[PDB]
């Protein structure tokens with residue numbers, strides 16, 4: 465199954481942190497990275513004084529069950545990270561999990577708010593321009609409809 469994961473960090477210098485998380489995702493059991501988006505520099509969603517964020521998307525091939533993958537992402541955030549409107553040492557959000565629709569106490573997929581977040585959508589559109597959501601919405605359509613500003617690379 466292909467899962468798409470969003471990564472964000474707003475350490476003043478987040479590259480080492482993001483590469484650590486990326487290595488950790490690749491080391492997840494029964495899983496491997498297919499593709500990584502470019503690294504993007506985004507203005508803080510939240511108070512405007514804190515450091516710019518680095519966002520990216522990852523396509524992860526996995527044989528894990530959805531809640532198992534989440535167990536790993538929470539673990540990586542704990543091991544590599546350390547709140548509300550930022551700063552964020554390290555977030556890993558499961559955006560999509562194959563074509564699965566999940567609505568449980570722990571996990572909502574597609575991610576509940578990505579349709580509103582250009583820092584999530586644009587990196588994803590870089591690696592999966594043809595992506596169709598489980599309900600038939602098109603990633604391309606969402607970006608066309610909303611006209612989110614394009615992002616500068618890191």
Ligand SMILES: CC1(C)Nc2nc(N)[nH]c(=O)c2N=C1C(=O)NCCN1CCC(SC[C@H]2O[C@@H](n3cnc4c(N)ncnc43)[C@H](O)[C@@H]2O)CC1
Pocket residue numbers: 471472473506507508509510517518519547548549550552555556557558559570571572573574575576583
């Ligand atoms: C400060 C803020 C708003 N501003 C930003 N500005 C820019 N420019 N860029 C950013 O990047 C950026 N980020 C920001 C941010 O603050 N993101 C956290 C989102 N994010 C929520 C889920 C969990 S943190 C809460 C809870 O959500 C649960 N969850 C439910 N569904 C899911 C799911 N699909 N994927 C993952 N977690 C799930 C999870 O169990 C956890 O307990 C992990 C992280």
